[PDB]
């Protein structure tokens, strides 16, 4: 019961970044993207019209994560600076300004993801993940246990649990409320560079630098499926699921996104077209578009 | 469609400022300083530490990190500056390990490395006194002979430490990137202009390959 060939193709090109793109996030409206690049700018794209909606200058040009608040009001970014910045988009003054600069991490920030518009969970290279209250700027909860840099985060659909990936080659699942590790299974041979949740919250897929992905479920305590081919020996930079999981889009350092069949573990397609390592990859909320950013400075919308 | 066309004006307005800002975020040369611990990193001029400087009206922006894996972010820099004091031995082989890890890193194979052999004074005075023997740590040094006021005693040893680093360089790279060794003292003002000359070579070399003259 395969899915044949998913001959997806470019439908837009969101040109405008002057440097390497590192992260983007789809707004809940399924229209607005926020993209972060080393140029030092956050650009709010209107995918439908290829229109730039906001441009947000940043204090630190070394961004490595970005987020779009589910309410659509706030966007967050993080990077080598140990401060996570929350920006307010619906300012009555018209311009976007910072609301809180979340200091407190000992190392670089690798992933940030809002939570119900008032709590933001971030992971840093100092081997810690943290949950914050944006208003006060304090760490409501601190997560420890990694033996290395934490590189990626993914919020569950319910937002009660979130998973982290670190360079210790283990995937750690955490509780926002209970504040201690629930699962820490391992199995990768190298750094876990990216993490994403399956739409049901019971699974998440790991992207590792050993050129192999793995599909984990909390009940299994082990990898269920592993995605790799002998002709691909480059690390995975980003991962995102499809609206029903079938279409596991994954970014690779070889300048193309391998479109893996989540259930079948077969390379059912390739969204080639990028001139450099494809870094970030995200599917819309409605499942109607997959936006792919790369170090080529181009964001492409595929359908 | 009147309101939607007004959004196009805002979209093109943003692109105008991005390229306006993108013409000054370029034309400055990013540099990464990966000197080893207990060295003269801060002498030759948030988690990230920056030090801007400019010679001949070219703006340099050097970056340091106190808090391996983030190195992938720096595959655009003009060069990497690896600073090691040439006076210690118990971690000099450790310093050579550090250089190899940078020279052979996947994302750095297109990046030249400027190597600063700082604290030559300490090495010069140290071997001149001879209170400790190099051969105890580098037995192969006993076979070395020089290839070139000026002291001929320690200069025999001075080029050995450079020889050790350059040997790690020519063993790989294959012309995609080059290692530019240097000797310096932590009083010298020449540290700034050495990098300027060295980045001109790196930039000139980059043109030679992307314009098909090599």
């Amino acid at each position: 019961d395969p899915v044949g060939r998913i001959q997806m193709r470019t439908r837009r090109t969101l040109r405008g970044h002057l440097a390497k793109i590192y992260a983007m996030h789809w707004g809940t409206d399924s229209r607005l993207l926020v993209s972060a690049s080393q140029d030092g700018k956050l650009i709010i794209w209107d995918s439908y019209t290829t229109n730039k909606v906001h441009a947000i200058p940043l204090r630190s040009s070394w961004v490595m994560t970005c987020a779009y608040a589910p309410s659509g009001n706030y966007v967050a970014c993080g990077g080598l600076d140990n401060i996570c910045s929350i920006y307010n988009l619906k300012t009555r003054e018209g311009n976007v300004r910072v609301s809180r600069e979340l200091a407190g991490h000992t190392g670089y920030l690798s992933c940030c993801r809002f939570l119900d518009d008032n709590q933001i969970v971030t992971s840093s290279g100092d081997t810690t993940c943290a949950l914050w209250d944006i208003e006060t700027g304090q760490q409501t909860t601190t997560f420890t246990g990694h033996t290395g840099d934490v590189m990626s985060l993914s919020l569950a659909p319910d937002t009660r649990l979130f998973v982290s990936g670190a360079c210790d080659a283990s995937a750690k699942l955490w509780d926002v409320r209970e504040g201690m590790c629930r699962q820490t299974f391992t199995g990768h041979e190298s750094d876990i560079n990216a993490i994403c949740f399956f739409p049901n919250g019971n699974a998440f897929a790991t992207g590792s630098d050993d050129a192999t992905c793995r599909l984990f479920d909390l009940r299994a305590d082990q990898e269920l499926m592993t995605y790799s081919h002998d002709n691909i020996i480059c690390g995975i930079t980003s991962v995102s699921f499809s609206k029903s999981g079938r279409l596991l889009l994954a970014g690779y350092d070889d300048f193309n996104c391998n479109v893996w069949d989540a259930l079948k573990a077969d390379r059912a397609g390739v969204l080639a077209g990028h001139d450099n390592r494809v870094s970030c990859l995200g599917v819309t909320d409605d499942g109607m578009a997959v936006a792919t950013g790369s170090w080529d400075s181009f964001l492409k919308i595929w359908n | 469609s009147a309101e939607d066309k007004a959004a196009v004006e805002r979209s093109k307005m943003i692109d105008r400022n991005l390229r306006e800002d993108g013409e000054k975020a370029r034309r400055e040369l990013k540099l990464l300083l990966l000197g080893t611990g207990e060295s003269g990193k801060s002498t030759f001029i948030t988690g990230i530490i920056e030090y801007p400087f400019d010679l001949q009206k070219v703006n340099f922006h050097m970056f340091d990190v106190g808090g391996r894996k983030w190195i992938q972010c720096f595959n655009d820099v003009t060069a990497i500056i690896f600073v090691v004091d040439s006076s210690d031995y118990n971690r000099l082989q450790e310093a050579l390990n550090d250089f190899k890890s940078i020279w052979n890193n996947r994302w750095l194979r297109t990046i030249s490395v400027i190597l600063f052999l700082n604290k030559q004074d300490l090495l010069a005075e140290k071997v001149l006194a001879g209170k400790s023997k190099i051969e105890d740590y580098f037995p192969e040094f006993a076979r070395y002979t020089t290839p070139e006021g000026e002291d001929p005693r320690v200069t025999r040893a001075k080029y050995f430490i450079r020889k050790e680093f350059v040997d790690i360089s020519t063993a790989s790279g294959d012309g995609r990137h080059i290692c530019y060794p240097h000797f310096t003292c932590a009083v010298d003002t020449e540290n700034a202009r050495r990098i300027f000359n060295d980045c001109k070579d790196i930039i000139l070399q980059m043109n030679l390959r992307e314009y098909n003259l090599v």
Partner: single-chain antibody, 233 residues
Framework: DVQLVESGGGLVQPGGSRKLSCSAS????????MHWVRQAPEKGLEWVAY????????YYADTVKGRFTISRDDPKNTLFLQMTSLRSEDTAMYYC??????????????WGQGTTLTVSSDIVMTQATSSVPVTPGESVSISCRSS???????????LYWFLQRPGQSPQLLIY???NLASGVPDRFSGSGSGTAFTLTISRLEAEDVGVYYC?????????FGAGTKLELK
């Protein structure tokens, strides 16, 4: 907070000329486009001119085209409108209005207090409910009609609703036919389809009294209906 104050009005002798000035304060006026709007003393509203965020596009009302000259000075957060020659029908109140256009925008969010310039010596919006008595606790609903369907294929519908309370500048109630603007209580909501539309209110409050106004902003010129004056009793 946001605030726009304008001046330059006053009585004008026959054959004169005047410049209205709108001084923005407390917001990124450079990022907003500017509109001028007119209200006759007892004969409804009327659009005047338009200058965009970046003076790449300009528009004027037919009754003033050429005579007027809309100008802005972004670095000083000031807007102008140079008026050339004089005509008796120019007698009316003028208002300064801000609008910023991006996907989720709410054009016409803020209005100045206006400056009087009384003188002495295109799609059509319409609403049959010129005036109606109302009492507290009712759920009165107003209606306005269009000469062309406003549902452009985008799904956008550029009909607007405002409230010019007594002695007060208009405040944006519903933008793009259904959307609730900033500072507007939950009481208000626009609904319908196609060409005629209902601005519904529940639990009418004493502050919900004045003269409502409906305009269609599919394309320039912009046109007003006579509005709806509410007599509270």
């Amino acid at each position: 907070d946001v605030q726009l104050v304008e001046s330059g009005g006053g009585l004008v002798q026959p054959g004169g000329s005047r410049k209205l000035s709108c001084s923005a304060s407390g917001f990124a006026f450079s990022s907003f486009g500017m509109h001028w709007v007119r209200q006759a003393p007892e004969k409804g509203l009327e659009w005047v001119a338009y200058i965009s965020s970046g003076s790449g596009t300009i528009y004027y009302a037919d009754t003033v085209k050429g005579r007027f000259t809309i100008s802005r000075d972004d670095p000083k957060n000031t807007l102008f409108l140079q008026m050339t020659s004089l005509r008796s029908e120019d007698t009316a109140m003028y208002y300064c209005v801000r609008s910023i256009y991006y996907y989720g925008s709410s054009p016409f969010d803020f209005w100045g207090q206006g400056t009087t310039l009384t003188v002495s010596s295109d799609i059509v919006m319409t609403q049959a409910t010129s005036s109606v008595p109302v009492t507290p606790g009712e759920s009165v609903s107003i209606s306005c009609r269009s000469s062309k369907s406003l549902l452009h294929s985008n799904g956008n519908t550029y009909l607007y609703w405002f409230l010019q309370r007594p002695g007060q500048s208009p405040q944006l109630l519903i933008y793009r036919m259904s959307n609730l603007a900033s500072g507007v209580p939950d009481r208000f909501s626009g609904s319908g389809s196609g060409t005629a539309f209902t601005l519904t209110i529940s639990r009418l409050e004493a502050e919900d009294v004045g003269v409502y106004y409906c305009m269609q902003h599919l394309e320039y010129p912009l046109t007003f209906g006579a509005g709806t004056k509410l007599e509270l009793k």
